[PDB]
Amino acid sequence: NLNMDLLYMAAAVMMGLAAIGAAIGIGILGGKFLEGAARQPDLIPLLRTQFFIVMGLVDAIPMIAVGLGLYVMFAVA
């Protein structure tokens, strides 16, 4: 029945939006990391520490989104 074709598209939309948000929200942060590095490389290790510490936060909601997307697209099908 037409349950499964719409279920497919719902996961596709949620996960496409997740992908856009995560890609851009990390790109910005990494760009600032690189322009902070280039002015004084000797701080690369500390700023990379800070970079991961922060980026693990940006990747909070998009991970939830991908989890639900896979659940719907496979578990609920």
């Binding site: 002015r39 004084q40 490389p41 000797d42």
Partner: protein, 57 residues
């Protein structure tokens, strides 16, 4: 040029264009400045102040 209390020597020396001072930055791979607002307007004043300073010296 005041060398010693017992000897002084006249000297004509250049101050423009800027003479080379053996200021090699090979230790300064490590960084570059944050410029507020831009480096060229700063460099202009730096050179003018430097010339004034050497005339005073």
């Amino acid at each position: 040029k005041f060398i010693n209390t017992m000897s002084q020597v006249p000297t004509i020396s250049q101050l423009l264009p800027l003479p080379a001072s053996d200021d090699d930055d090979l230790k300064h791979k490590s960084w570059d400045y944050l410029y507020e607002p831009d480096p060229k307007a700063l460099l202009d004043t730096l050179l003018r102040r430097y010339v004034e300073s050497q005339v005073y010296q």
